[PDB]
Design a protein around this ligand. Sequence first.
Ligand SMILES: CCCCCC/C=C\CCCCCCCC(=O)OC[C@@H](O)CO
Ligand SMILES: *C/C=C(C)/C=C/C=C(C)/C=C/C1=C(C)CCCC1(C)C
Ligand SMILES: CCCCCCCCCCCCCCCCCCCC
Ligand code: NA
Length: 224
Amino acid sequence: MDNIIMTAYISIFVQIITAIISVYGLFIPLNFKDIILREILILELIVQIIEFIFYIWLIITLQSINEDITYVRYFDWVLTTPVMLLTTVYFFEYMNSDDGIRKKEINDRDYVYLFYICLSNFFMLLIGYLGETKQINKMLTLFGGSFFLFLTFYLLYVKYTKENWMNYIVFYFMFLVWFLYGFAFMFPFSIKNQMYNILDIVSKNIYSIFIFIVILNQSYKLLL
Ligand SMILES: CCCCCC/C=C\CCCCCCCC(=O)OC[C@@H](O)CO
Ligand SMILES: *C/C=C(C)/C=C/C=C(C)/C=C/C1=C(C)CCCC1(C)C
Ligand SMILES: CCCCCCCCCCCCCCCCCCCC
Ligand code: NA
């Protein structure tokens, strides 16, 4: 119980500071080519609203835990993970497009493919939820959930990446971190929840901080 709470507080600490940083980031002036970074940052903040509601619910609920509450995380994930996949797509498009590109152009062009990515991701989550609530066994959950994780990341890779180390860093870091949520699923209640509390810092807050630093680097001359 104590370590779940402690890791929850660590996660909340990083969430609060990341939210402050992100809000300031929204007001950094941007060159034309960089406008999509602010569109990404807005969406990451929206993800943070959901995440924070979950964490406040969690620390209140852990005072009197009587059931395995791990499944409640899926009510966050089903909202936040599709947004995070979209923002990832936007960032790859930003890195890889020779000319300035915005989210409306991407959405209007690729909505069908983006739906495929989010549908694959939804099946991953649904299988996980069935496993977390013990409606299917753990082995089926891991193999089915991992199948859809792979499919999601494959769809992302083949449409939106380029073959260079910048792309490999962003793609593989993310893929590994998301895979580690499946790794966490295997562990008992306390360890599993500690792992999710800390993985959220990496999958969400570190991404926001990254986008903020990219914004600051691109725009520092407009600031100074
Ligand atoms: C235009 C600059 C791009 C430079 C790209 C590579 C350079 C430096 C490393 C940046 C920090 C690591 C990558 C953060 C973005 C990322 O993968 O987050 C995924 C994470 O949340 C977990 O899922
Ligand atoms: C902010 C929260 C995030 C990014 C949550 C991510 C969750 C996953 C990538 C879940 C993965 C799973 C597997 C790969 C296998 C089946 C069980 C899951 C759902 C935990
Ligand atoms: C002992 C049980 C409770 C442990 C609480 C403390 C756990 C802290 C683990 C690290 C937290 C920060 C994670 C940062 C990201 C990991 C590496 C990222 C590389 C880019
Ligand atoms: Na459970």
